[PDB]
């Protein structure tokens, strides 16, 4: 039967679990070709790199399984969205569905096209010129030899604005549902397992905690999330202790209504008119969704991009502000800017501390030494800079710091004066403190940011090349047999296999669950995360009889 | 060869051959590897330096352009920021190379309505394109040196730690005196494997013994299974002391 095994090899998945008994057990299941292809999709496989990075660096080990399960949930939701978007009234609805699907599929190409249009529209502006006469006081106009440049500028500006609008629409169509799903999933988790609203209330520092109270009474709370009985479970858990009717009012549900609907309920005909649709819209839920979507970092950046695109029609040079997109338009540019943003608070406080020592030098140079700060070569009038404390402080900061030699090369030399030694000490201390000492800090901070980033990358690589992710057993034990660690990492315990098993359990019906699948499902509903093999494997369980 | 031929047309073309010392000295290429390695980041940093200067040029072109006159005589002016091309060239060519920044080249803003704006402009220019955008350049090459040294020491440690063929650590062999050295020079030796492969290739097929025939027929199929992976003679016969 070799041929059948070769045919069904990609579709057969195996998983090791702790099991009901004290022995590690192995489960075989089916993997769909569509799911396998979506997993082999480059971005889905790219998300694993980031998940691994955030669990290895700045990540615990006791909560590692919970984080892995949350990552699996997010990946399943993204796969569902990708499957959804793959490939009079009814006519307009169908056309708009195709339009939204097209935007969702081609979201990134719109971003790249916007970058290209910004570069072209900024190249065109390099030919601009100021004149006194018309082509009143100033007559800024584009001077060029080859014609068809102003019409090109106008058309490119219009096209850039249109592409920016399409980018906003595509982002709102494709990326927002994941954010909403995560927010609602977390809210349901802490509502049913911690009772943050039943027991006590969210703290005043939790602005999102206060904002989450809006969807408690809405009839669309479990939307954009797998579970729709979270309110029922919360009621059944907290009613006996905090008052069943109180919890029902808090969650906006009617126990009598649900009971009578369970007994027998009449189904009214759905009216499709806009008049009834208006109140079919859940205003409070939409308000909460808008509140949680307007705080997104990416959405605010896209809104700023759109605002700048609109302002570009008022004045063309505003389009130059779009060049900054290359900071987040190139993968490696953001990596080299991470060495500046990371460890940047220290940079801010160092540049703030630089403003204090200059103040001390200003006070010293204001009580005395202020006859040297004259800057007028003619005797007609003086141009003293240290007569006031504000002017002297401005002079030292603006001119003294930027000077290569320090403060000594700007003011009158102290030769042949009573305060020659004091001025020499003053200048030398200034040069050795605010030039060679307070800039080495700035350089060292960023150099060490680079070094620490490299150390983090190599640490992640070593950790993943050293020991197993699930069991935690080192590779030395598995390396007794040839290619033991690789065989273990690709066949025995595989993250893709665990994700596929979770998706299979979610998809398949409850009545079709076998004993082991039922056990895993009922343990999964309670966030136990105990069925995962921790510190044990099938080979270790059956070292004798050679497994 | 082409440069040598062109040297007869004009002698100074021979100067182009001095660059051969880059690849004519062993250590010169090692110290140039710290610049070539991690050099894409250098190219993109110097490209990004050309964008912030463009932004400063736009800001200094819409206004602040009365300070860019460079003619000391009143006979004629020599404005540099009247055009967007000339102003961008001035900032890149002269502003970046200046030690103090852009503030030491243009007219001082003292006694003017835009004094504070010009001070902010100059200070931001100096703190962004001088002390920040050059520390990146220096740090990249310094870290290239450091990473090269780390690679060398990692290779040394890996070869001094465990066996190349078996992969067994030196701790197991060190039970007997000089066990790891004896294993690396006698039990499994890369030179011995190369010599055996050459001997099998050279000798006739009809003269192969059983073991040589087995190794040869396994070698023709790219199996690479006859190599001892995770096992050795001492581990196979720990009892009876091999
Ligand atoms: Zn494992
Ligand atoms: Zn060996």
Q: From ligand 2's centre to the CA of B89, what distance in Å?
A: 64
Does A492 show up as a binding residue in the annotation?
A: yes
User: What are the Cα distances from residue B199, in Å, to A238, A286, B213, B215, B227?
Assistant: 81, 80, 12, 12, 17
Closest to B55 in 3D by CA, of B18, B84, B24, B27: B84
B187–chain A Cβ distance below 8 A for any pair: no
- Residue B138 and residue A443: Cβ atoms within 8 Å? yes
Does A226 show up as a binding residue in the annotation?
A: yes
Q: From ligand 2's centre to the CA of B129, what distance in Å?
A: 56
| Contact (CB, 8 A) for A326 and A125 | no
Backbone angles phi, psi at A141, to 5 degrees: -155, 155
B100–chain A Cβ distance below 8 A for any pair: yes
**Integer Cα distance of A406 and A424 in angstroms:** 12
Tokens of A102: 């097209």
First to last CA, chain B: 62
Strands A141-142 and A128-129: antiparallel
Q: Which residues of A touch B87 (CB under 8 A)?
A: none
B167–chain A Cβ distance below 8 A for any pair: yes
Backbone angles phi, psi at A272, to 5 degrees: -90, 10
**Integer Cα distance of A49 and B47 in angstroms:** 29
- Residue B83 and residue A336: Cβ atoms within 8 Å? no
Strands A128-129 and A25-30: unpaired
**Integer Cα distance of A210 and B16 in angstroms:** 72
Q: What is the DSSP letter of B162?
A: B
In chain A, positions 423-452, which contact chain B (CB-CB < 8 Å)? 439, 442-443, 446-447, 450-451
| Structural biology method used | cryo-EM
Structure-derived torsion over alpha carbons of residues A44, A45, A50, A55, reported in degrees to the nearest 10? 110
For A130: left if phi > 0, alpha if psi spans -120 to 50, otherwise beta; the answer is beta
**Integer Cα distance of A375 and A400 in angstroms:** 14
**Integer Cα distance of A347 and A341 in angstroms:** 9
CB pairs A-B closer than 8 Å: 93
* DSSP tally for chain B: helices H, then strands E: 12, 0
Q: A25 - beta bridge partners?
A: A17
User: What are the Cα distances from residue A440, in Å, to A294, A409, A437?
Assistant: 41, 22, 5
Tokens of A51: 């998940």
- Residue B101 and residue A125: Cβ atoms within 8 Å? no
Q: From ligand 1's centre to the CA of A489, what distance in Å?
A: 6
A330–chain B Cβ distance below 8 A for any pair: yes
**Integer Cα distance of A104 and A87 in angstroms:** 10
Tokens of A153: 């500028």
| Contact (CB, 8 A) for A383 and A374 | yes
**Integer Cα distance of A433 and A357 in angstroms:** 9
| Contact (CB, 8 A) for A531 and A56 | no
Tokens of A39: 């997993």
**Integer Cα distance of B162 and B183 in angstroms:** 11
Tokens of B236: 């196979």
User: DSSP 3-state assignment of A13?
Assistant: strand
B77–chain A Cβ distance below 8 A for any pair: no
Q: What is the resolution of this structure in A?
A: 3.2
* Residue in B with minimal Cα distance to A320: B55
**Integer Cα distance of A255 and A261 in angstroms:** 10
Contacts of A158 (CB under 8 A, 6+ apart): none
Tokens of A467: 């020991």
Size of chain B in residues: 242
Does B185 show up as a binding residue in the annotation?
A: yes
**Integer Cα distance of A328 and A114 in angstroms:** 13
Structure-derived torsion over alpha carbons of residues A31, A37, A42, A48, reported in degrees to the nearest 10? -10
Alpha helices in A212-325 (DSSP H): 230-242, 244-251, 255-263, 274-280, 283-293, 297-314
Q: A12 - beta bridge partners?
A: A30
**Integer Cα distance of A195 and A251 in angstroms:** 12
Locate breaks in chain B with C to N over 2.5 A; list the residue preceding each. none
| Contact (CB, 8 A) for A365 and A358 | no
| Contact (CB, 8 A) for B57 and B78 | no
B163–chain A Cβ distance below 8 A for any pair: no
DSSP string, A105-168: HTHHHHHHHHHHHHHHHHHHGGGEE--SS-------EE--SSSSSHHHHHHHHHHHHHHHHHHH
Q: What is the DSSP letter of A467?
A: B
Helix (H) or strand (E) run with residue A180 in it: helix A176-193
Closest to A499 in 3D by CA, of A40, A55, A21, A73: A73
B138–chain A Cβ distance below 8 A for any pair: yes
Does A464 show up as a binding residue in the annotation?
A: yes
Q: From ligand 2's centre to the CA of B221, what distance in Å?
A: 24
Q: From ligand 2's centre to the CA of B158, what distance in Å?
A: 14
Block residue for tokens 């549900």? A253
Closest to A65 in 3D by CA, of A521, A470, A523, A518: A470
B211–chain A Cβ distance below 8 A for any pair: no
- Residue A339 and residue B142: Cβ atoms within 8 Å? no
Tokens of A13: 């998945």
Query: Can you list the pairs that B67-72 forms with residues at least 24 positions away whose Cβ atoms lie under 8 Å?
Result: B67/B106, B67/B107, B67/B109, B67/B118, B68/B106, B68/B107, B69/B107
Contacts of B148 (CB under 8 A, 6+ apart): B33, B34, B37
Helix (H) or strand (E) run with residue A12 in it: strand A12-17
* DSSP tally for chain A: helices H, then strands E: 26, 4
Tokens of A311: 């302002």
Structure-derived torsion over alpha carbons of residues A34, A37, A38, A39, reported in degrees to the nearest 10? 120
| Contact (CB, 8 A) for A283 and A217 | no
In chain A, positions 381-400, which contact chain B (CB-CB < 8 Å)? 394, 397-399
Tokens of A279: 């109140």
Block residue for tokens 């009985």? A229
Distance between alpha carbon B64 and the CA centroid of its chain, in Å?
A: 41
Among the partner residues B104, B135, B146, nearest to A442 by beta-carbon distance: B135
- Residue B84 and residue A326: Cβ atoms within 8 Å? no
For residue A534, the ligand closest to its alpha carbon is 1
Tokens of A448: 């060490």
**Integer Cα distance of A202 and A216 in angstroms:** 13
User: DSSP 3-state assignment of A29?
Assistant: strand
DSSP string, A34-90: HHHHHHHSHHHHHHHHHHHHHHHSS--SSSHHHHHHHHHHHHHHHHHHHHHH---HH
| Contact (CB, 8 A) for A502 and A76 | yes
Block residue for tokens 């520092």? A205
* Residue in B with minimal Cα distance to A476: B168
Closest to B88 in 3D by CA, of B54, B121, B65: B54
Choose, out of B37, B84, B112, B138, the residue to mutate when testing the contact with A (most A CBs < 10 Å).
Answer: B84
| Contact (CB, 8 A) for A122 and A157 | no
A479–chain B Cβ distance below 8 A for any pair: yes
């Amino acid at each position: 039967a070799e041929s059948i095994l070769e045919y069904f090899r990609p579709y057969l998945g195996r998983i090791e679990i702790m099991g009901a008994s004290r022995r590690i057990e192995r489960i075989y299941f089916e993997i769909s070709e569509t799911n396998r292809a979506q997993w082999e999709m480059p971005q889905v496989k790219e998300s694993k790199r980031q998940f691994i990075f955030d669990v290895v660096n700045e990540g615990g080990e006791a909560e590692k399984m919970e984080l892995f399960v949350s990552f699996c949930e997010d990946t399943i939701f993204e796969m569902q969205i990708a499957a959804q978007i793959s490939e009079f009234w009814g006519e307009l609805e169908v056309q708009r569905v195709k339009f939204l699907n097209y935007l969702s599929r081609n979201f990134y190409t719109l971003r790249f096209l916007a970058l290209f249009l910004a570069f072209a529209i900024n190249f065109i502006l390099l030919f601009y010129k100021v004149s006194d006469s018309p082509p009143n006081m100033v007559y800024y106009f584009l001077e060029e030899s080859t014609g068809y440049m102003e019409p090109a500028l106008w058309c490119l500006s219009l096209l850039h604005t249109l592409v920016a609008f399409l980018c906003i629409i595509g982002y709102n169509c494709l990326k927002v549902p994941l954010v909403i799903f995560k927010r609602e999933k977390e809210l349901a988790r802490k509502l049913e397992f911690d009772g943050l609203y039943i027991t006590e209330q969210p703290g005043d520092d939790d602005v999102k905690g206060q904002w989450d109270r809006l969807v408690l009474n809405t009839p669309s709370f479990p939307s954009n999330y797998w579970d729709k009985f979270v309110k029922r479970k919360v009621l059944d858990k907290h009613g006996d202790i905090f008052g069943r009717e109180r919890i029902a009012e808090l969650l906006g549900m009617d126990l009598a209504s649900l009971e009578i609907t369970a007994h027998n309920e009449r189904k009214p005909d759905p009216p499709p008119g806009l008049l009834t649709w208006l109140m079919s819209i859940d205003v409070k839920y939409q308000i909460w969704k808008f509140g949680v979507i307007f705080t997104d970092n990416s959405f605010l950046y896209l809104g700023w991009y759109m605002v700048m695109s609109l302002l570009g029609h008022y004045n063309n040079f505003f389009f130059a502000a779009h060049l900054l997109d290359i900071a987040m338009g190139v993968k490696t540019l953001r990596t080299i800017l991470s060495s500046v943003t990371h460890n940047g608070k220290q940079l801010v406080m160092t540049v703030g501390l630089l403003a204090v020592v200059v103040y001390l030098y200003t006070v010293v140079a204001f009580n005395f030494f202020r006859k040297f700060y004259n800057k007028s070569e003619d005797e007609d009038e003086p141009d003293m800079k240290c007569d006031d404390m504000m002017t002297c402080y401005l002079f030292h900061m603006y001119v003294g710091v930027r000077a290569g030699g320090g403060i000594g090369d700007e003011i009158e030399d102290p030769a042949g004066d009573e305060y020659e030694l004091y001025r020499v000490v003053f200048d030398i201390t200034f040069f050795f403190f605010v030039i060679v000492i307070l800039l080495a800090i700035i350089q060292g901070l960023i150099i060490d940011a680079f070094g620490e980033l490299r150390d983090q990358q190599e640490q992640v690589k070593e950790d993943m090349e050293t020991k197993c992710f699930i069991c935690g057993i080192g590779s030395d034990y598995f390396d007794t047999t040839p290619h033991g660690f690789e065989t273990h990492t690709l066949e025995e315990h595989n993250l893709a296999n665990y994700m596929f098993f979770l998706m299979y359990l979610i998809n398949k019906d409850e009545t079709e669950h076998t004993g082991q699948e039922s056990y895993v499902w009922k343990m999964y509903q309670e966030r136990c995360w105990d069925f995962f093999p921790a510190g044990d494997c099938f080979r270790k369980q059956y070292e004798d009889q050679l497994s």
